[PDB]
Design a protein around this motif. Structure first.
Motif, PDB file in Angstrom:
ATOM      1  N   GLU A   4       2.324  -0.625 -11.062  1.00  0.00           N
ATOM      2  CA  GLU A   4       1.751  -1.555 -12.019  1.00  0.00           C
ATOM      3  C   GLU A   4       2.841  -2.561 -12.347  1.00  0.00           C
ATOM      4  O   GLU A   4       2.584  -3.763 -12.442  1.00  0.00           O
ATOM      5  CB  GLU A   4       1.302  -0.823 -13.282  1.00  0.00           C
ATOM      6  N   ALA A   7       3.009  -4.747  -9.743  1.00  0.00           N
ATOM      7  CA  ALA A   7       1.906  -5.664  -9.887  1.00  0.00           C
ATOM      8  C   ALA A   7       2.219  -6.717 -10.897  1.00  0.00           C
ATOM      9  O   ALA A   7       1.837  -7.860 -10.706  1.00  0.00           O
ATOM     10  CB  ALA A   7       0.637  -4.949 -10.281  1.00  0.00           C
TER      11      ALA A   7
ATOM     12  N   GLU B   1      -3.745   4.144  -7.219  1.00  0.00           N
ATOM     13  CA  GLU B   1      -4.336   3.294  -6.214  1.00  0.00           C
ATOM     14  C   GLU B   1      -4.722   1.994  -6.872  1.00  0.00           C
ATOM     15  O   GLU B   1      -4.539   0.960  -6.258  1.00  0.00           O
ATOM     16  CB  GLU B   1      -5.556   3.929  -5.543  1.00  0.00           C
ATOM     17  N   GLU B   2      -5.230   2.009  -8.113  1.00  0.00           N
ATOM     18  CA  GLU B   2      -5.552   0.756  -8.777  1.00  0.00           C
ATOM     19  C   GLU B   2      -4.293  -0.058  -9.058  1.00  0.00           C
ATOM     20  O   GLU B   2      -4.346  -1.280  -9.000  1.00  0.00           O
ATOM     21  CB  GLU B   2      -6.294   0.944 -10.099  1.00  0.00           C
ATOM     22  N   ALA B   3      -3.185   0.599  -9.434  1.00  0.00           N
ATOM     23  CA  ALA B   3      -1.907  -0.057  -9.720  1.00  0.00           C
ATOM     24  C   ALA B   3      -1.249  -0.608  -8.463  1.00  0.00           C
ATOM     25  O   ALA B   3      -0.685  -1.699  -8.480  1.00  0.00           O
ATOM     26  CB  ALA B   3      -0.974   0.917 -10.398  1.00  0.00           C
ATOM     27  N   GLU B   4      -1.343   0.131  -7.368  1.00  0.00           N
ATOM     28  CA  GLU B   4      -0.811  -0.292  -6.096  1.00  0.00           C
ATOM     29  C   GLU B   4      -1.719  -1.365  -5.594  1.00  0.00           C
ATOM     30  O   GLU B   4      -1.257  -2.369  -5.080  1.00  0.00           O
ATOM     31  CB  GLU B   4      -0.696   0.862  -5.110  1.00  0.00           C
ATOM     32  N   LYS B   5      -3.019  -1.191  -5.803  1.00  0.00           N
ATOM     33  CA  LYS B   5      -3.981  -2.189  -5.443  1.00  0.00           C
ATOM     34  C   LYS B   5      -3.669  -3.402  -6.254  1.00  0.00           C
ATOM     35  O   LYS B   5      -3.683  -4.484  -5.711  1.00  0.00           O
ATOM     36  CB  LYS B   5      -5.407  -1.735  -5.688  1.00  0.00           C
ATOM     37  N   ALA B   6      -3.358  -3.247  -7.545  1.00  0.00           N
ATOM     38  CA  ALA B   6      -3.013  -4.385  -8.360  1.00  0.00           C
ATOM     39  C   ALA B   6      -1.776  -5.023  -7.784  1.00  0.00           C
ATOM     40  O   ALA B   6      -1.686  -6.241  -7.739  1.00  0.00           O
ATOM     41  CB  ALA B   6      -2.782  -3.990  -9.804  1.00  0.00           C
ATOM     42  N   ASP B   8      -1.010  -5.025  -4.719  1.00  0.00           N
ATOM     43  CA  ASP B   8      -1.450  -5.667  -3.505  1.00  0.00           C
ATOM     44  C   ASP B   8      -2.260  -6.901  -3.838  1.00  0.00           C
ATOM     45  O   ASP B   8      -2.219  -7.865  -3.101  1.00  0.00           O
ATOM     46  CB  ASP B   8      -2.306  -4.749  -2.666  1.00  0.00           C
ATOM     47  N   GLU B   9      -3.017  -6.877  -4.923  1.00  0.00           N
ATOM     48  CA  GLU B   9      -3.805  -8.018  -5.342  1.00  0.00           C
ATOM     49  C   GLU B   9      -2.878  -9.101  -5.800  1.00  0.00           C
ATOM     50  O   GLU B   9      -3.107 -10.273  -5.510  1.00  0.00           O
ATOM     51  CB  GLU B   9      -4.735  -7.667  -6.494  1.00  0.00           C
ATOM     52  N   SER B  10      -1.822  -8.707  -6.508  1.00  0.00           N
ATOM     53  CA  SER B  10      -0.831  -9.610  -7.029  1.00  0.00           C
ATOM     54  C   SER B  10       0.043 -10.110  -5.898  1.00  0.00           C
ATOM     55  O   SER B  10       0.394 -11.282  -5.896  1.00  0.00           O
ATOM     56  CB  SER B  10      -0.004  -8.930  -8.081  1.00  0.00           C
TER      57      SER B  10
END
Lengths: 57, 57
Positions: A4, A7, B1-6, B8-10
């Motif tokens: 995060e 992120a 996964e949401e934080a890593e996804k974040a 990755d989104e970032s």
């Protein structure tokens, strides 16, 4: 927290470059205005060139 | 996964935005080049205007 944080760091990086994109968008828009005006003048100065050059003739 | 996804989104955000910021830097540079060319046309259009306006005088 690290992902995060990554992120957030990635967003901070992104916000600097998003802000940069925006600075460049703003500069582009300012420059776009300056272009229509620089070109307006290129044309207007030529329009005036002809008005005065015509008077010169 | 949401934080890593974040992350990755970032990070993808940065790749798109950095590339976009660069595209904007390029469009901005292009507007700078173009307004400068137009401005230089204006410098010469105005200069030429001055030559004919001066000659008119």
């Amino acid at each position: 927290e690290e992902a995060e944080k990554a992120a957030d760091e990635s967003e901070r990086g992104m916000k600097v470059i998003e802000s940069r994109a925006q600075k460049d968008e703003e500069k582009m828009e300012i420059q776009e205005i300056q272009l229509k005006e620089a070109k307006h003048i290129a044309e207007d100065a030529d329009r005036k060139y002809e008005e005065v050059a015509r008077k010169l003739v």
